[PDB]
Structure 1
C-alpha cells in the first residue's frame, strides 16, 4: 500500500502500484493484466520485482471494471482499456523520474499493450507480450468467449460468463468491438524491439497468435516456453518473468 497510486481517466479512478529501484531516475515499465484478472497476480508482481532488482521501475494498474479501479466490468471494452493505457502512458511520460518507457502485457493485456504501442511507436521503447490474447477477436466472431456462447450476429446486451468468472457479465459492446478490432494492423506499426513469450501448453490462446505477432513485427523475438500454461503458473512464472526482465535489462 506504500506503492499505491491513482490516476483519472474520463471520470474513472484507476488504482495502481508503483515499484521503484534505489535511485531517483529509472526506466519504467507499464504492466498490464488480462480479462477478469487484476494488477496483483503472482506473475505481474514477479515481473515487477524482477524489474526492480534490475534498476527498472514499474507501474501496474487495475483496468476499469477490474480490481480496485472504478467502473462496472460489463462496461469494459478493449478500446477503453487502451484509453486507460493512454492515461497511464501520459502519467509515466510526464513523470520527471523516467528515462525510457516499456509496455508489458499478459493475455488481453498483451493486446492492449501491443495496440497502445502501435499508436505510440515513437514514445514506447520496448514491448514484452506474454501469451497476448489476440484470439479474443476470433472468439467474438465465433460466438464463444471463454466458454460463454452467444449468437455472434445477435450479441445480447450482456453475456454471462462461466467457470471461474461465474457471476460476471461481459458487455455486448466488448464483444461487438472485439469482432472488428484491428489488432495486428495497429500493433504492426511498432518497429522497435518486441519480445513475445508464450507457453507450448497454452490451452486458452492458441500459440499461433504469438507466432503471428512475431511474423508481423519488424524487430521481434519469440520465446516458446515448453510445457508452460496460459497463466504461467508455478515454476513457469519464474521463467516468464525472467525472460521479461532479460529483454528490458539496462545493459550496465
Structure 2
C-alpha cells in the first residue's frame, strides 16, 4: 500500500508491499534517473520478493514521480539523503528484521553509497546495472555535451532541466571509495548489451567489494526490458531469499 515520508520539507511518495506475517525482512527499492517507483522492473521485484516473504519499499526520489522537489534541484547527494530517510523509517518499523538495498542504474549508485555509509545496518545489497559512469560523464561534458570547467545553472534535456549542481557534485563523487566500506554480500546484475553503462563500472564494483558476485544477463539492455526483467528479478530474489 501507499506511504509518504518527509525529507527537509519535501514529501516522498512510495509503495509498501508486505508478505503474510508479523515479522519479515525488508528491501528498499531504488529507481534510476528520470524513472519512478513504478517501473516494471521494480514492481516485479516487489511482487516476487513478497512471494518469498520479503517486504519491500520503493519511493519516488525527490524531483521524480509523485514526490516533491523540482527535477533540477536533485543531486545524487540529496537522493542519498532521500534514501537515508527511507532507511530510517524502515529501521524503526517493528516488523522489519533484516534490511536489504536494491538499486537500478543511478539508484544502484545511491544504494551502493548508502551501503558504504551504513555497512552495519544493511545486510545484503543488489546492484542492477549501477550507473557509476555518471561521474565520468560529468567530468567529460556528455551525460548532449557542455563545458565541464564552466557548467551552467541547468542544461536542457526533454523539458526536465538538469541542475548544474548535480553535474559539479557528480564530478567529485567518491562512489567506489564510500562503497568499499561495505563488506556484507553484494550481488551485481548487468546486461550483456547495456549501451548506457559500460562493463568496466560493474566489473569495478566486483573487484572493490570484498563480498560480491557479478552476474551477467545475456543480451539484456540497460533497463532489463521485457523478458530480460525475469532474469534480473530471478537473480535478485535468489540473492534475497530468507
| TM-score normalised by the chain length of structure 2 | 0.99
Matches within 5 A, 1:38-57: 38-57=36-55
- Structure 1 partner of 2:181: 189
Helix, strand or coil: the match of 2:122? coil
Deviation at 1:24, TM superposition (A): 1.3
Aligned partner of 2:33 in structure 1 is 35
The structure 2 residue matched to 1:230, chosen from 216, 222, 233, is 222
* Residue from 147, 151, 154 that aligns with 2:150: 154
The question of whether the paired residues in 2 share the 8 Å contact of 1:110 and 1:133 is answered with yes
Count of residues paired in the alignment: 242
Retained in 2: the 8 A contact 1:141–1:152? Answer: yes
> Are the equivalent residues in 2 in contact too, given 1:131–1:197 (CA < 8 A)?
yes
Alignment of 1:122-161 (within 5 A): 122-145=120-143, 148-161=144-157
Cα distance in 2, alignment partners of residues 159 and 126 from structure 1: 36
Instruction: Show the counterpart of 2:194.
Output: 202
Q: Secondary structure at the match of 1:149?
A: coil
Given the alignment, which residue of 193, 206, 210 partners 1:218? 210
Whole-angstrom CA distance in 2 between matches of 1:207 and 1:158: 29
Distance in 2 (CA, whole Å) between partners of 1:54 and 1:81 is 29
Alignment match, 1:240: 232
Q: Does the 8 A contact of 1:131 with 1:207 survive in 2? A: no
Query: Deviating runs (4+, > 4 A) in structure 1?
Result: none
Q: Provide, for residues 191-246 of structure 1, a one-character-per-residue CA deviation record: whole Å limited to 9, x for no partner.
A: 00000000010000002100000000000010011100000001000110110000
CA distance in 2, matches of 1:41, 1:207: 23
Q: Quick check: 1:94 aligned with 2:92?
A: yes
- Aligned-residue Cα RMSD (Å) equals 0.5
- 1:10 paired to 2:8: yes
Q: Could you tell me which residue of structure 2 aligns to residue 84 of structure 1?
A: 82
* Structure 2 unaligned regions, length at least 5: none
| Structure 2 counterpart SS, 1:228 | coil
Query: Runs of 5+ in structure 1 lacking a partner?
Result: none
**With structure 1 as the length reference, what TM-score do the two structures score?**
0.95
- What corresponds to 1:104 in structure 2? 102
